[PDB]
């Protein structure tokens, strides 16, 4: 009951749908010599309509690919080119105007090393 009502909260905090089922709502349960089956099949069914929802549209599968791709440094060729531009910024004893220059130098080498999708990689914000 707890977990179902969490997936129903994911949809209330989504705009694409406000519900999981559109074939368990034709049915109504109201059981007590069989509560156990009805609650469970309305649970995996909400789970199945959320599993295709991340995979398709939200593209979780590309989402976790990208999160994994930068931080382990597996777009390595890009990250060694941009680090050479970074070591030029470490020449200045630290300021507050550092990251606004570095997100600028980010899009220089991005087109130099000509990564597979340059607008998806404009989401790397450089913190100080």
């Amino acid at each position: 009951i707890l977990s179902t009502g969490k997936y129903l909260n994911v949809v209330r905090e989504c705009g694409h749908d406000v519900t999981c089922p559109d074939a368990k709502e034709i049915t109504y349960t109201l059981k007590e010599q069989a509560y156990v089956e009805r609650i469970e099949k309305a649970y995996n069914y909400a789970s199945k309509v959320l599993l295709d929802f991340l995979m398709e549209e939200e593209e979780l599968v590309a989402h976790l690919r990208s999160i994994k791709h930068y931080f382990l440094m597996d777009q390595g060729d890009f990250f060694v080119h941009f680090m050479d531009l970074t070591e030029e910024e470490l020449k200045k004893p630290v300021d507050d105007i550092i990251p606004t220059r570095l997100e600028a130098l980010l899009e220089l080498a991005l087109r130099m090393s000509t990564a597979n999708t340059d607008p998806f990689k404009d989401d790397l914000k450089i913190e100080l």
Partner: protein
């Protein structure tokens, strides 16, 4: 920016670089008139590694082309490719005939065409925003590439002493000494300039090429154009982590860094396994990751001649193993575990050896995204055996009295024969002295 101006030079050295550009078009995912395949940016990440950056999807090769023969450079400009080339950033179109076919012809032509030869690598470095360096693709075979290539080794390290120098020296045919009998003089002369104006070389021996080329391709006899094929694959294999991503040695000034113990020991053994014509019946069932990199460190893919009787009398110190394509990358460290168990890697007798392994994902192209490729670029202490082979032929030849007054036709009217003898025996010793 990692901008390389390659200097392809020589009579064989132009032809090995002709097929070097023919190798790149099929793996960058591009047709030579524009981006028309969109596998071009998704598959190959850095389309300006050996090209200019797009100004409308037009690409200019960063090669420059001088030779004493106009036939070799005309065998690039009449080929099925020709607008990929742009001869006004490459070479001023029409370069005359040489005297020629001497080392000493190409060597003085550096001195009088010094203004123009260093003004054509500043017509392609007018799109470089910070030049990486120069890779000198010059042949020590012919006096043509070796004449002009011995000049550019001196002069690129004093006007550009901050840039990379590193050569693809492919040596004369050692078997021969009745064809190319000018081999001990012109070979050793270029090697003097490589031991004190260069920190790394990649040597290739031509008699060792044909040991692997009929054991893998199974041709009747390797000709000149069937020997240039084997060469264009190992050039394009050596620079993959500069065009495809790795986390290890992803700069070429990274790649080179882990392979030089000391100046005067940097002569690198190259090996490259996949040239067999029945690889195709063994890529369909998968030959496992565990044993496709325990066969590179075993000699049966080598390009640099060595005995079989001196391989336990010398020890590798740094060995680089570039794997290409997806191989299953999580038992690649399980495979290098089994190297120490066999002892295919030797260790120095005062320290440990180091096997730097790198990997990369690759563009759509079926002989490399379905067929594992292993390039070894070793640095073994067994390399003096080549120098014992040339030295024993060099001092015998000067007792013929050949080419001690026939080499003197041009720009040698002084004694520098005993300098060459002495600079080879200093090399041979500082290699041998390293290991105890």
């Amino acid at each position: 920016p990692r901008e390389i101006i390659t200097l392809q030079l020589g009579q064989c050295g132009n032809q090995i670089g002709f097929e070097f550009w023919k190798q790149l078009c099929a793996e960058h995912g591009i047709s030579p008139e524009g981006i028309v395949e969109e596998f071009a940016t998704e598959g190959t990440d850095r389309k300006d590694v050996f090209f200019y950056q797009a100004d409308d999807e037009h690409y200019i090769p960063r090669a420059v082309l001088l030779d004493l023969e106009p036939r070799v450079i005309h065998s690039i400009l009449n080929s099925p490719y020709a607008n990929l080339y742009n001869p006004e950033n490459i070479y001023l179109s029409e370069h005359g005939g040489g005297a020629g076919n001497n080392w000493a012809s190409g060597f003085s032509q550096g001195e009088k065409i010094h203004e123009d030869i260093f003004d054509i690598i500043d017509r392609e470095a007018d799109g470089s925003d910070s030049l990486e360096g120069f890779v000198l693709c010059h042949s020590i075979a012919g006096g043509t590439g070796s004449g002009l290539g011995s000049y550019l080794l001196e002069r690129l390290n004093d006007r550009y002493p901050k840039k990379l120098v590193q050569t693809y020296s492919v040596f004369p045919n050692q078997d021969e000494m009745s064809h190319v009998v000018v081999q001990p003089y012109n070979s050793l002369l270029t090697l003097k300039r490589l031991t004190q104006n260069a920190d790394c070389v990649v040597v290739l021996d031509n008699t060792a090429l044909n040991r692997i080329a009929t054991d893998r391709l199974h041709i009747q006899n390797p000709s000149f154009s069937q020997i240039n094929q084997l060469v264009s694959t190992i050039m394009s294999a050596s620079t993959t982590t500069l065009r495809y991503p790795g986390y290890m040695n992803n700069d070429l000034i990274g790649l080179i860094a882990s392979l030089i113990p000391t100046p005067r020991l940097h002569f690198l053994m190259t090996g490259y396994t996949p040239l067999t014509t029945d690889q195709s019946v063994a890529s369909v069932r998968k030959t496992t990751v565990l044993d496709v990199m325990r066969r590179l460190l075993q000699p049966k893919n080598v390009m640099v001649s060595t005995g079989r009787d001196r391989q336990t009398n010398h020890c590798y110190i740094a060995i680089l193993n570039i794997i290409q394509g997806e191989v299953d990358p999580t038992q690649v460290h399980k495979s290098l575990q089994r190297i120490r168990e066999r002892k295919l890697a030797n260790f120095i007798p005062w320290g440990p050896a180091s096997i730097q392994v790198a990997l990369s994902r690759k563009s759509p192209y079926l002989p490399s995204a379905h067929r594992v490729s292993g390039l070894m670029m070793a640095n073994h202490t067994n390399i003096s055996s080549l120098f014992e082979r040339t030295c024993r032929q060099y001092d015998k030849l000067r007792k013929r009295e050949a080419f001690l007054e026939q080499f003197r036709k041009e720009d040698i009217f002084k004694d520098n024969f005993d300098e060459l003898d002495n600079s080879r025996e200093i090399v041979q010793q500082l290699i041998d002295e390293y290991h105890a």
